[PDB]
Structure formats: structure tokens, C-alpha cells
Amino acid sequence: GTILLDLAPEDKEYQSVEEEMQSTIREHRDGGNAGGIFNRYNVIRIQKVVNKKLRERFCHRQKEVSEENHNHHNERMLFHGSPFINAIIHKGFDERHAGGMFGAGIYFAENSSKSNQYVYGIGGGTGCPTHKDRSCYICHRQMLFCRVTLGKSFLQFSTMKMAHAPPGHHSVIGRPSVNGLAYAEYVIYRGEQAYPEYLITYQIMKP
Ligand SMILES: Cn1ncnc1[C@H]1c2n[nH]c(=O)c3cc(F)cc(c23)N[C@@H]1c1ccc(F)cc1
Ligand SMILES: [Zn+2]
């Protein structure tokens, strides 16, 4: 099954992942309601996720997408927050579990703070299980930093609800715009198009 390999804080790989997590924090339109109020995280640990079966499905799909995109799979490393991270690291992403702006897909953010708004559910739900606080500064949260095969992407500023990527395409990118999205989002419609590469355990920090 799945093996988690702990990254040391002195490793350049650990440092690269933390830097991407910290530097992509942005100012949210809800004032912190969903994800909590913070300017930085406290990273507890970063683990590499190893799953032979998930890797095989991912690599198989990556080759199909590369062939349909002029031999370029076009991967991006993107964040994913979910109260179901334990199932994802064992079973992978599953599009069958997909109100989304781009329809029935699997969603990722390039801004870690956007994925953080989803760690405890839509709008943060009732927050951490122990204290029922969306802004809990004690409980450890988890998010994934994933390899996402975008292939030939379809870029949009406004909502476009679909069941699958458009013909010939492999993903949908929602870009920010005035009167549109605040931050980008990336959507795939096949679970095998993402690999949950890193598992980050963290706390948000009180300003
Ligand atoms: C609530 N939910 N369930 C599965 N995926 C999600 C959300 C989501 N989860 N996780 C992320 O990191 C994320 C990063 C984004 F840029 C954008 C996202 C998400 N939108 C998703 C969304 C929001 C409302 C909705 F009705 C359906 C889907
Ligand atoms: Zn708590």
C-alpha cells in the first residue's frame, strides 16, 4: 500500500515545498471566514507519498496525455485541501466524488491559502473536529502538494460547467479577473491525472 517518507527540514526538497506553500498565501475576499486568519503557516512535517498502484495509473495516463499534446504532458505542482486526504493517499483522486465553477472535476489551487479554505469542508465547515473552530491555531491540518497532468488546457475566466475536458483537451484552468475569480483554479476530470506527491502537516499562525 502507501508508504510515507519523511523529508528532513535541512533538505532542499523540503525547503522548496515549504517556500511554495508560504509564498502563495493570498488575501481572501471572505476576510478569513473559511480558512482562518493568518499570514503564515507553521509546517510540522512534509512527507513524500509512495504508492505503486497510484504511480502506475498516473504514469499510464501521463503517456496518453503527452501523445495528445505534441509530446508534452504539461505537469504543474498544485495544492489540494480536503477532509478526505487519508482516502486520497491510499486510493487516489476519484472524479465520481465530484456545484463547482467548472463542473464535475477535481480541483486544485496554485495558492495554498485557497486549498486551506477546504481542509475542513466547504466554507471550512465547523472547523477543526476538537474545538469547532475554522481558525484553530492548535490542531494540525493537512494538505497535499500534487503532480497534476494538465496536458492541453482550456483556459476560462467565467464559469463553464462540464462533465469532461473539452474535445482534444485534458484540463480546465480558471484564471482570475475583475468581477470573476479572485485566484486561479485547475480542474481535471480523471483522477489518474493527479498524483498526491507531498503530504504537508501544518498549523496556521495567529498574526
Ligand atoms: C468542496 N470540494 N469538494 C471537492 N472539491 C472541492 C473544492 C476544492 N477542494 N480542494 C481544493 O484544494 C480546491 C482548490 C480550488 F482552487 C478550488 C476548489 C477546491 N473548489 C472545489 C469545489 C468548490 C465548490 C463546489 F461546489 C465543488 C467543488
Ligand atoms: Zn482545534
Query: What resolution, expressed in A, was reported for this entry?
Result: 1.5
Is 146 within any annotated ligand binding site? Answer: no
| C-alpha cell recorded at residue 135 | 481558525
User: Is ligand 1 within 6 A of the CB of residue 108?
Assistant: yes
Spacing, Cα 113 to ligand 2 middle (Å): 18
Angle at 96 between CA 147 and CA 111, to 5 degrees: 35
Which range marks the domain in which residue 16 is found? 1-207
Dihedral pair phi/psi, residue 45, rounded to 5°: -160, 160
Domain count, the chain: 1
User: Is ligand 1 within 6 A of the CB of residue 103?
Assistant: no
How were these coordinates obtained? X-ray
Spacing, Cα 179 to ligand 2 middle (Å): 34
| C-alpha cell recorded at residue 62 | 501521463
Helix or strand holding residue 101 (H, E):
none
| C-alpha cell recorded at residue 146 | 500534487
What is the C-alpha separation between 3 and 116, in angstroms, rounded? 24
